[PDB]
Amino acid sequence: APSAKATAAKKAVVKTFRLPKTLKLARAPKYASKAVPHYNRLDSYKVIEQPITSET
Amino acid sequence: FAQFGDLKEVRLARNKKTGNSRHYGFLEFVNKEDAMIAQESMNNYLLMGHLLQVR
């Protein structure tokens, strides 16, 4: 027989997938593309253009 | 050497005058297969200070 204890001693001597939800960083640009904010495109005054004085 | 299996006899060559060993000795196993396996596994096994030699 090989004396399995000797074999153990010899061994000791010798020795559905899917895209994981990875962390996503939110946008944090170093600078704003249009830092200077734009004024109201359609303010209250611009909503009403001209009065209508038709007799009807 | 008992880890590999049962050891029958072990003796060490010591100086007659001083108790220190001569760094060599002999030992016998109850099975020839175990003895040859141990020799193969320790044929050139590196040890502290010097590589062990077994035949």
Side-chain angles (χ1 to χ4, degrees):
Chain A
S3 86
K5 180 160 182 184
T7 64
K10 177 185 164 189
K11 180 261 280 181
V13 175
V14 173
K15 302 183 172 74
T16 304
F17 173 86
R18 243 192 172 80
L19 168 52
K21 306 184 177 66
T22 182
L23 187 277
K24 306 179 282 184
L25 286 310
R27 283 234 83 194
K30 303 286 182 187
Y31 60 88
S33 173
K34 60 196 308 204
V36 174
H38 202 291
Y39 55 85
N40 191 347
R41 310 313 212 291
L42 176 57
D43 58 65
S44 296
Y45 293 86
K46 298 294 187 194
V47 170
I48 321 193
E49 291 195 332
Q50 270 198 117
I52 288 157
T53 51
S54 71
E55 293 180 17
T56 183
Chain B
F1 282 102
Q3 295 283 357
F4 289 77
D6 192 1
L7 205 147
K8 198 189 288 186
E9 295 181 18
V10 63
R11 302 167 100 169
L12 197 74
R14 288 167 176 283
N15 181 276
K16 194 190 286 177
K17 186 150 68 178
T18 180
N20 55 48
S21 78
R22 299 182 146 188
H23 307 121
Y24 85 97
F26 315 81
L27 45 92
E28 177 168 351
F29 295 95
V30 307
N31 183 15
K32 301 186 180 71
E33 194 158 12
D34 186 10
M36 61 178 68
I37 288 158
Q39 179 264 331
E40 291 161 20
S41 56
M42 243 58 63
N43 192 3
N44 296 285
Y45 184 88
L46 192 282
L47 198 55
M48 68 186 64
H50 30 272
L51 81 174
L52 189 69
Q53 207 80 90
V54 59
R55 297 282 180 279

